[PDB]
Design an enzyme around this catalytic site. Structure first.
Site, PDB file in Angstrom:
ATOM      1  N   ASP A 164       0.837  -1.214   0.000  1.00 24.53           N
ATOM      2  CA  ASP A 164       0.000   0.000   0.000  1.00 24.53           C
ATOM      3  C   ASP A 164       0.884   1.282   0.000  1.00 24.53           C
ATOM      4  OD1 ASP A 164      -2.918   1.206   0.368  1.00 24.53           O
ATOM      5  OD2 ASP A 164      -1.684   2.053   1.984  1.00 24.53           O
ATOM      6  N   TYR A 211      -1.310  10.896   2.564  1.00 23.81           N
ATOM      7  CA  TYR A 211      -2.189  11.209   1.426  1.00 23.81           C
ATOM      8  C   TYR A 211      -2.249  12.693   1.097  1.00 23.81           C
ATOM      9  CZ  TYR A 211      -4.388   6.536   1.875  1.00 23.81           C
ATOM     10  OH  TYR A 211      -4.611   5.187   1.931  1.00 23.81           O
ATOM     11  N   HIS A 232      -7.271  -6.501  -0.408  1.00 24.73           N
ATOM     12  CA  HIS A 232      -6.271  -5.470  -0.135  1.00 24.73           C
ATOM     13  C   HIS A 232      -5.311  -5.797   0.985  1.00 24.73           C
ATOM     14  CE1 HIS A 232      -4.511  -1.488   0.120  1.00 24.73           C
ATOM     15  NE2 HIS A 232      -4.684  -1.530   1.442  1.00 24.73           N
TER      16      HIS A 232
END
Ligand SMILES: O=C1COc2ccc(Cl)cc2N1
Ligand SMILES: O=C1COc2ccc(Cl)cc2N1
Lengths: 547, 547
Positions: free
Chosen positions: B334, B465, B523
């Site tokens: 990730d 992010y 995921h």
């Protein structure tokens, strides 16, 4: 007045220069003079090499472009290149051959020691070769000794562009007249000079250092042998392992390769190995410098029995289990040296090799109580004073600075006679209240020990001496064994307690024992003679402990 | 009712048995039957072998005594031994050939998982052979799975002496009728039976396990494929490195060999690698499982810019510098997978090899703002919701247990649609207040994440992010580069955000890229399919990352 020194890498901090290999290859291959050096600089600021040096492309991407430039250059000079010629091979050999220029590094270290801000400013590349680790190792060793490392491929700017110089001055937070700049390429030296920086064109190191000495006013040449690199506690990796419910062990970790577990003595710290840790790691070992049970950031339970050799050794085996290490080489000093011989006797499968500084291996006497044995030797009187719980704790804890200043002293500076300690009524009874600072330690190093011992005091450490009977009974179980794994005994000429002579019968029990001996060395081996300790350990490790 | 299971080592937990090699050597060398097995047991309780098994002498000291016994036995049988015959060679080969009996270990694991106290009780020696590490490694792997390991050479007692059995029961804190004892030697089984212990004579594993199942009432045979060994946080070595004044990085460390640095994603922990850590270490690697900046015991500064890729990568290089590591293999998932591709692009000399789970390598588009690029894909809407400081923090921090229970779910259990998150007004808007526990996690594992996130919350993690423009500008500097160091891309069939298809053009930039693919995997790759992750990583590490 100068306060900053800047060094180039190729031809300055590292030798032989990579540039000189292009000329050397031409001569060895009888190619036209400057043919390779010409293909290298082809296109100038728009060429393949500038793109490489600015970080636009990697070294592996550059290799075929350099090859095409070599073809283009040979075509113009009306010559041919051999059918075995390889740019990759030439550069692999050149990079591998390039080593740190030790007197240049020593000069930078000395300048930084006097308050200078030091930096490496270099035109370099992004190395993705299969053999890139060699260069990574070299940069790692060098960079730790400088305040800043500025690489062209990282900043996207290159020497001699004037922007890299303004960037250099901005990082240094200094005006040009405060900066010395050493470079082996005159063209790269020019913009620094233009800004008013003191510049040095480096051809041979000696002349460059004479120029450097003259301009800084600091002796850099013909200077005494420096001490090995030490440790700054706040810059180390600190490890913590719970070996059982109330017991955690702390260690400092540095390096890669075979695990080397350093075990200090009384009343010490992992910090007692400060001069060995960087040397052993640089030598290709993964160093684990312990705070032994009862010390520093390791747990200090109050019970006497928590400190017998059997439990201490079991906990060190659990420590390896929790870290996932099937083995480690065990190196000990004083109480740590005694621990390490017992690790070898009881857990040989977990001990890669064993080394002791000062502490000899003497088999337990089953026909005599350990207390009588200690009484037989006048120098072991301090051990008797340590027996009664609370007595030595009180004296040792009263004034920590005085404690470490009185204990940690070289052969010619001693303040403590360890005979008739009980009769006198303590270790520091005929000792000054404000001892002078030993040549082995700085005031700052003393304060580190003071701060460490503020946590748990001397109860846990003193308990290592309070298990004579328990240790004797356990040691007697090993009387039929011999130590047959690789072993090193290191004696210190002037340790008047752990005398070299006490180790004389050791080959009766360790037939393959290797030896080291340090002259004009007292009890505090690691800090008394760090250079010789490092030399002896690295030589024995490389020959007997692998890599 | 039984509550304790005891296993022998030779012929029970490890196969082939060392005893059988004496018989095999006789047959291979055409020597009289039982000649070697006779020299082995010569003198019985007073003989060389009993002394060895009680710890009186070491294995290297025993070898010449066994040799003399072999000579004495051949003299009586009126035969001769070959002039190349070596007891050391026979035992080196036998010990090296002996491996863990996997179904026996699996049975012990299952019994301990149900509440049983498990122990290894073994007649063994003090191994000081030059090749002792092999046995040390085997004992290390086995012992971690048991409550107790009792070795004859450590306790000074041997099977079949009745004292070792009373010692066994004392350590177990259980009465004999509560104990199952498995041994391959009937004579060694006899004293346990005499005390009223349930005993099993082990010849072939399958029959022994059928007997074990019958007596315990627990299914041990034909049972489903077990999960890899996990991590107990309190049993790990915890490391701490200061990378700069206000930033410290925490990691868990296990194993020896090439350094493998594990980098988790959002919103995770070092604990997300719990199933990989023991497997990778057992495979011959030194594992460093990070708490990435902003998470767990690592520092979490509040500033957005502290979390841009450039600074995160610089700090990871400083982390290697402080540990004394010139390189590490970097494996990420990730956000960790994105970090790892940038480590390879900007610091190739420090990256031994690079592997990413789910996160593909997509070069930055210099002709489009990163915000527009994220808007172009409906599945990336959650990233837009994460932009505004405080909004996602509030929702994610409101109820931690609900947060991790809602996020950490397998492909067939999902509760969160990551499209129209902004429009809906959050991740958990159409999500239950008390989510069901996923098959991938226990309630205890969820509570670990809850406890970790209590320290710093989601600000630092969400900031990963919040640097889209900054990361894009930095990434654009690398557009002329290619990744030419060893690389592995691992895709997860059912990750609907990091879809396998997004990785399809990767060989344009990583020509030598190796691949792995996991079917029926969402995921949360590491915990969704741990067995396959371990298999893919260990295979790629052994082939491309050394050892
Ligand atoms: O000079 C020495 C030699 O032996 C020693 C042994 C133990 C302690 Cl605590 C101090 C010293 N100092
Ligand atoms: O199922 C998934 C796949 O992608 C994801 C990406 C990010 C986050 Cl926070 C959660 C998920 N969950």
């Amino acid at each position: 007045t100068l306060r900053a020194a800047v060094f180039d890498l190729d031809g300055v901090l590292a030798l032989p220069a990579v540039f000189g290999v292009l000329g050397r290859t031409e001569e060895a291959l009888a190619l036209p003079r400057g043919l390779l050096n010409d293909a290298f600089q082809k296109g100038g600021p728009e060429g393949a090499t500038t793109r490489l040096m600015k970080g636009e492309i990697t070294l592996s991407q550059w290799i075929p472009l350099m090859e095409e430039n070599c073809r283009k250059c040979s075509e113009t000079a009306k010559v041919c290149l051999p059918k075995n010629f390889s740019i990759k091979e030439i550069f692999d050999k050149a990079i591998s051959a390039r080593k740190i220029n030790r007197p240049m590094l020593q000069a930078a270290l000395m300048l930084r020691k006097k308050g200078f801000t030091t930096a490496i400013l270099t035109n370099t590349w992004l190395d993705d070769r299969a053999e890139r680790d060699g260069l990574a190792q070299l940069m790692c060793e060098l960079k730790m000794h400088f305040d800043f490392l500025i690489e062209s491929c990282q900043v996207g700017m290159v020497k001699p562009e004037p922007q890299i110089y303004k960037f250099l001055l901005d990082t240094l937070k200094a005006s040009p007249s405060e900066v010395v700049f050493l470079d082996d390429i005159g063209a790269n030296l020019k913009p620094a000079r233009d800004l008013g920086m003191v510049t040095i064109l480096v051809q041979d190191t000696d002349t460059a250092l004479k120029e450097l000495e003259k301009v800084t006013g600091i002796q850099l040449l013909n200077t005494p042998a420096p001490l090995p690199t030490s440790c700054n506690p706040s810059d180390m990796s600190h490890g913590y392992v719970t070996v059982k419910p109330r017991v955690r062990l702390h260690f400092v970790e540095l390096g890669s390769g075979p695990a080397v577990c350093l075990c200090h003595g009384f009343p010490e710290s992992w910090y007692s190995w400060r001069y060995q840790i960087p040397a052993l790691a640089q030598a290709g070992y993964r160093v684990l410098a312990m705070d032994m049970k009862g010390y520093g950031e390791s747990s200090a339970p109050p019970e006497i029995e928590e400190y017998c050799m059997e439990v201490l050794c079991k906990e060190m085996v659990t420590f390896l289990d929790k870290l996932g290490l099937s083995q480690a080489v065990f190196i000990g000093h004083d109480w740590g040296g005694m621990l390490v011989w017992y690790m070898a006797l009881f857990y040989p499968e977990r001990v890669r090799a064993v080394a002791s500084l000062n502490t000899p291996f003497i088999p337990a006497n089953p026909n005599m109580s350990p207390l009588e044995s200690i009484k037989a030797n006048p120098v072991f009187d301090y051990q008797l004073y340590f027996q009664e719980p609370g007595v030595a704790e009180a004296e040792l804890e009263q004034n920590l600075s005085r404690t470490f200043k009185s204990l940690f002293r070289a052969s010619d500076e001693s303040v403590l006679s360890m005979h008739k300690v009980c009769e006198a009524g303590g270790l520091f009874v005929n000792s000054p209240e404000e001892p002078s600072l030993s040549r082995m330690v700085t005031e700052e190093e003393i304060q580190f020990y003071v701060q460490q011992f503020k946590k748990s005091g001397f109860r846990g450490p003193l308990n290592w001496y309070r298990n004579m009977e328990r240790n004797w009974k356990w040691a007697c179980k090993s009387l039929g064994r011999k130590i047959l794994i690789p072993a090193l005994m290191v004696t210190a000429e002037k340790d008047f307690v752990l005398v070299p002579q006490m180790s004389q019968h050791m080959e009766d029990w360790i037939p393959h024992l290797k030896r080291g001996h340090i002259e004009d060395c007292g009890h505090w081996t690691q800090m008394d003679k760090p250079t010789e300790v490092n030399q002896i350990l690295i030589k024995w490790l490389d020959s007997d402990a692998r890599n």
